[PDB]
Design a protein around this ligand. Structure first.
Ligand code: B12
Ligand SMILES: C#Cc1ccc(F)cc1F
Ligand SMILES: [Ca+2]
Length: 106
């Protein structure tokens, strides 16, 4: 009886680089980008983030109040432990995906 035609999908968003960690299932419209997931998570309450505009599209600079500093970046991953090959405005997760934001240093 539930919708199985995927007009609405659900994507788990997780951030484990912070204490306390964040993990929530976020429902969004089909075809949503990662950025749409971040927007929804913020709208629902209990999540925040910031981006910076660029010629390559929005770049994720801060997650849950923690801004990336020198030689750090917020990395985007899908299951299993696989970094995305597109940014937040271009990657469109599949229904049931888990997107992780991970603070990585080089
Ligand atoms: C080095 C690099 C990075 C470095 C940049 C550090 C630095 N240089 O100071 C770091 C590690 C931070 C990085 C991160 C990411 N990046 Co990168 N990166 C590169 C790379 C290999 C070279 C860029 C460069 O030095 N260009 C030369 C300088 C002179 O030109 P520039 O225009 O000023 O370059 C800047 C931008 O490229 C920006 N940048 C780098 N990556 C990304 C990704 C996105 C989405 C944006 C908006 C900007 C951006 O940082 C550069 C320095 O300021 C390119 C491949 C390429 N195109 O060259 C990718 C590339 C741009 N990155 C890419 C990706 C996917 C990512 C990540 C999403 C990976 C991830 N899974 O987390 C993240 C960004 C997530 C976020 N927080 O928004 C993709 C983008 C494809 C797309 N547009 O959808 C590219 C094209 C590689 C690829 N083909 O897979 N990246
Ligand atoms: C960005 C970026 C990036 C990170 C790791 C890698 F093996 C290739 C890349 F373009
Ligand atoms: Ca059903």
């Amino acid at each position: 009886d539930h919708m199985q035609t995927q007009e609405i999908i659900s994507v788990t968003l997780q951030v484990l680089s912070l204490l306390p960690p964040y993990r929530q299932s976020i429902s969004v419209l089909a075809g949503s980008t990662v950025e749409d997931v971040l927007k929804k998570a913020h709208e629902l309450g209990g999540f925040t983030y910031e981006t910076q505009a660029s010629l390559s599209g929005p770049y994720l600079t801060s997650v849950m109040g923690k801004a990336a500093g020198e030689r750090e970046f917020w990395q985007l991953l899908r299951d299993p432990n696989t970094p995305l090959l597109q940014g937040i405005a271009d990657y469109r997760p599949k229904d049931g995906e888990t997107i992780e934001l991970r603070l990585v240093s080089w």
